[PDB]
Amino acid sequence: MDLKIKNKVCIITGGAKGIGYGIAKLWASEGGIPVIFSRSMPKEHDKELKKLSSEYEFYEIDLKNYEQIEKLVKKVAIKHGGIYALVNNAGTNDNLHIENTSTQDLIKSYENNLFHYYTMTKECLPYIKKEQGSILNIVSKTGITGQGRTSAYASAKAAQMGFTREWACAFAKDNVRVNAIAPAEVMTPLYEKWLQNFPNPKEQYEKIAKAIPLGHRFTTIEEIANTAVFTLSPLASHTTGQILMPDGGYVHLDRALNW
Amino acid sequence: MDLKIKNKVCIITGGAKGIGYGIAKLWASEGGIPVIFSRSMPKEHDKELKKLSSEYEFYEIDLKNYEQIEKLVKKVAIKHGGIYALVNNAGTNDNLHIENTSTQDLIKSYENNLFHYYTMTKECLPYIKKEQGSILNIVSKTGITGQGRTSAYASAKAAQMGFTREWACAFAKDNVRVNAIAPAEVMTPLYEKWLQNFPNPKEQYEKIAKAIPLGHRFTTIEEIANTAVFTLSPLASHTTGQILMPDGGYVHLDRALNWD
């Protein structure tokens, strides 16, 4: 299947690790040019991305600094001639519960998880409109389902679903598509380290994983990336405003399901 | 992108024309083997599918005949060694409004549009489970949004969304994925024929298409097929229970949206 993304530039925030890095590698392996906006880039990942895409670039960026985003997005467009797509992905679940988190720390969490989806999209939009490209917002099941001790992350993820619908409305006339992917449980190196905090890591994994109908196992980075890159590509040219769940059935299947 | 469907068999009901045929062609272009279950097969379409896949087959079938379905699904599995996927797609919008349609005629509509989704899936399931394959139900925006003068079609399409969720639950343990695609307005030769019946076909098209946010134009068969075949493939290996809308924004974006 020819995704028709050869030499198309995609900026990926938080693209140096985890889901974002999986999207970056697949974008490059399909002929696209990934541009990584992250605070840091592991040297081994820089090496692999360079092997996959000779025009790939890493831009060291503090996504809480709006002026740095404006400067760096413009440098990307100058270097490459334009931008076809943006994947907003930087952020983490910081488990900030309302009952012991101040409003000020909610806002600090939004600085880390929410506001740069807006700033990045604002600055990329003139270029993405010119190329009739794509915006993809990586969100989370938690913005749909809740979780119970993570008010700041849950509301940021839902806000980004709202941006997805709003920007889909705003730019459909421009033939710019705007979609989101809501992963549920995705195995990443960071998740693996978290599981290793537990007295029995395999037991904790199985405790979480048994609630996933399809295979009682976490989604893979590859599975998220496959749907992300297909959705960004022109082969998904009438898909907009969608919140996509490649999640093993986590959101939609009967909560009581078991083996 | 390597979809990893080389030599995998997919049965497509209503696969001789329109959306089903687009799925069949793309399945074959990507290395899969499409098997078409329909009442008839255009000669030119048979020629094109054979050009794409020497093992493609057309089986003439009355999808209201459950025993013929049983016998022909078995024939496919014997011939090819198994079945990886099923696309349930046969049916039409017959615009049967409740106020002037008897319950008997509702049921006759279900014979045309609904019951064979169950029968086909029942008979394919042992084979698809063995191959840890995929079931894809083609439904319609109308099962979600309603329309207003098509009770039989709307309820059949919604019933099939129910089957999608139920079968996803039933066979997740078997690593069988079950999903649906809900197209909105898809340009097909059948749609073009329907439009040509109006005194002003262009204006009728534009009246409908102006309500589609992405481009004020119908979805293409290729757009439906691309999402269908990707979803069927092992690359969507954690996608199940989904009702997918490649639809230009028809279901989800503000109904008031316009280009002003």
Numbering used by the authors:
A (entry chain A): 1 to 259
B (entry chain B): 1 to 260
Task: Copy text verbatim from the article accompanying this structure deposition.
We also characterize the putative dehydrogenase Cj0485 through crystallography, enzymology, and multiple biological assays to confirm its function as a fucose dehydrogenase, which we have named FucX. Several aldose sugars in both d- and l-configurations were screened as substrates and Cj0485 displayed substantial activity on l-fucose and d-arabinose and with low levels of activity on l-galactose. The Cj0485 monomer adopts a Rossmann-like fold comprising a central seven-stranded twisted β-sheet sandwiched between two trios of parallel α-helices. The holo-enzyme’s asymmetric unit contained four monomers that were arranged as tetramers with identical D2 symmetry to the crystallographic tetramer observed in the apo-complex. PISA31 analysis predicts this recurring tetramer to be a stable conformation, supporting the likelihood that the tetramer is the biologically relevant assembly of the enzyme.
To provide insight into the substrate specificity of Cj0485, we solved X-ray crystal structures of this enzyme alone and in complex with NADP+. The apo-enzyme crystallized in the space group C2221 with two monomers in the asymmetric unit and the crystallographic lattice generates a tetramer with D2 symmetry. A Cj0485 monomer from the apo-structure superimposes on an apo-FabG monomer with a root-mean-square-deviation (RMSD) of 0.9 Å (over 246 matched Cα atoms) revealing the similarity of the folds. Furthermore, the tetramer of Cj0485 superimposes on the tetramer of apo-FabG with an RMSD of 0.99 Å (over 1003 matched Cα atoms) indicating adoption of the same tetrameric organization.
